[PDB]
């Protein structure tokens, strides 16, 4: 079972990557903490210092991985205007069919989100972690976007962030 | 969660004002800000960080506090310092503290106005009671029609403290239908303040 | 260095409102733009911010789903749209810009707009009826005024004798009647000996309905 993300334009099959991390924004303002994919600009993404040569949004593609467990970093955990950089210990493949979709193992992604929620729980001391879609922004930032071979591709990521974790 | 104390502060010009702001579910960071706000104006930044004055803020304003307790001090109040003050931490704001000018007790000048004939032609009668230049703000205004106490048919509002004498003024309107207004004779508003009641009245016919 | 906001708005319940905020005198893209609202007589309430480089916002949980923040870098203008308007959305809506900070804590709002009044009510815009508060005497001092009744929405301005008379003038805050219309009074105390010779006119301007009323107040 795979999460089939719609993408435009259709990414060639050789543009498949390994998701090595992502960047989150905590919801501002019920004992729950809500996170969404970061809508921050390129400079904000670069500050995580876990990317590789591939430029992408909401998800680091072909970047660096942590050693043993997921590592979450933030300049200020209590500042919702500061991004949360998440570095995965094990990457998550996103295989693009070339027919307008890129697929991700749903069980792998759920296990990844569960680990991220565990690290967020020990950081915010909470009991419920919720992932929700992007609040909005320009097309490159509201969608999971990336540069492959000099061409920009846009994949809707709403399926990747809509879930609850206790 | 930011809660300030006291809610209201009454002080004379020239003396010290101490305002408090406590963060409840915090680990403790110096990321606090104090703002001043006057009526009809946007907030003005006074203190950023725990203790750093904003650009051009006069020396009498200071901030301090560590952990969950924070204090804003005005060492010697100037007449323009009497306003509302808020604290802020990230997106949270305190509920605000209003600083008002303490002065001596002053009795109001009470006037009563019958409805004008022009308004009466529209079928509604408004009776206005004016409390002019009194202190403190607390005043009990009662309407009496043929010496019977009214209820649920009047509203009132109070001005801000006057710039010249620091007093308040109050206006109260009793609203009745023309039919109800013309079946009664004596209209009066009674103002009670500190062992003193003043009643100004008129007779509708006269 | 200023933030210029759009004019006041009047809306029915269930409708939406869009408020603009034009920045000048500083690099618009180098600061987040926040939005803070204040209901009449209440405190400040943060609504969200927007990143001007990417357009990516972060809303307060309270307004998530009803608010949309956008921007246009070509004109250095940020927009805030609030949908599903309720009566308790009546407030002054401010845009606020945090200052650059050594610790990079971008929540110190040293720059604010002047605010945009949004009134949400089922009532309809209506000019005021101005009635005289005629004088008739506390020992050499007489009180007179104007009753400004049944107008919507706020605000109205009152002057006396085209602004020539300001001493002793008290213009009270408006009360909201159960009809949904506002009503206020403006009074002034003058020497009793001037009632026969000095003319007194209250100038009531209600810009929301484009109505100006000049009322001469004569002794009764
Ligand atoms: C990531 O790496 C794989 C294998 O090295 C490559 O085929 C793919 O194109 C890369 N992804 C991007 C977006 O360049
Ligand atoms: C992801 O990494 C694995 C090894 O961990 C490698 O075999 C695979 O080709 C990579 N996938 C992509 C799409 O680059």
Author numbering:
A (entry chain C): 1 to 29, 33 to 169
B (entry chain L): 3 to 27, 27A, 28 to 91, 96 to 211
C (entry chain H): 2 to 52, 52A, 53 to 82, 82A, 82B, 82C, 83 to 100, 100A, ...
Copy the relevant paper text.
The GT strategy for inducing VRC01-class bnAb precursors is rooted in the hypothesis that these antibodies target the CD4bs with a similar angle of approach to VRC01 and use the same conserved contact residues.
Moreover, VRC01-class bnAbs have very distinct and targetable genetic and structural characteristics. Specifically, they have restricted immunoglobulin heavy chain variable region alleles (IGHV1–2*02 or *04) and a short five amino acid light chain complementarity determining region 3 (CDRL3).
